[PDB]
Design a protein around this ligand. Structure first.
Ligand SMILES: [Mg+2]
Length: 227
């Protein structure tokens, strides 16, 4: 049972390579997860310089590979695909469609490296508008709460998820980002295929006052429900 790897605090490393409309960038993340409380504390740094898209547009890319840190109440533990795939892990893919603008396509490999949970990601963004809300940096530095709806994909011995993120524009409007996600196990062992349910996520974005590099400090809670 992979769930046994998550009874305490687990260190996390996130590494992302991106290209959006030919702007290339990399982000490195460090922090920890405590699934007992559905709690993620992470600090992300753009190692190539300035991030060419707003930080909030990368939150699902940078964290949805660590949905293994969701708190599954005991009565629903037989629905926790994510932990059950550990330690060998899973491949997560996402298509993120920004209404009236471009899209992101991501691939991540999520697994243990020793006692550390690692998220290795590639992002490709295309057909963004030069001064739309994303390349024009018109998004506020904040993050609304929302749910991730999960369904089983028995075919792939995995799960799918669908959800809408509403990013706050600086003028009071909303920039919608439709998400379609699929996860497939990397290993051979059996995994838990869940009944339909969702993850309730809440996120606070902040800055480290002594950090001069372009960065994002993130506190996130993720809790399974719907059953
Ligand atoms: Mg049943």
């Amino acid at each position: 049972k992979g769930e046994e790897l998550f009874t305490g605090v687990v260190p996390i490393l996130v590494e992302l390579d991106g290209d959006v409309n030919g702007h290339k960038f990399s982000v490195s993340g460090e922090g920890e997860g405590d699934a007992t409380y559905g709690k993620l504390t992470l600090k992300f740094i753009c190692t190539t310089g300035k991030l060419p898209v707003p930080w909030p547009t990368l939150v699902t890319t940078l964290t949805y590979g660590v949905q293994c840190f969701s708190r599954y109440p005991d009565h629903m533990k037989q629905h926790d695909f994510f932990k059950s795939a550990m330690p060998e892990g899973y491949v997560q893919e996402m298509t993120i469609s920004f209404k009236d603008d471009g899209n992101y396509k991501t691939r991540a490999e999520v697994k243990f490296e020793g006692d550390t949970l690692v998220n290795r990601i590639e992002l490709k963004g295309i057909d963004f508008k030069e001064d739309g809300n994303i390349l024009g940096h018109k998004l506020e530095y904040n993050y609304n709460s929302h749910n991730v709806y999960i369904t089983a994909d028995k075919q792939k011995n995995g799960i799918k998820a669908n959800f809408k993120i509403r990013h706050n524009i600086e003028d009071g409007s909303v920039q919608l980002a439709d998400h379609y996600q699929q996860n497939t196990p990397i290993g051979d062992g059996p995994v838990l295929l869940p009944d339909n349910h969702y993850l309730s996520t809440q996120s606070a974005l902040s800055k480290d006052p002594n950090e001069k590099r372009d960065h994002m400090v993130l506190l996130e809670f993720v809790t399974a429900a719907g059953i």
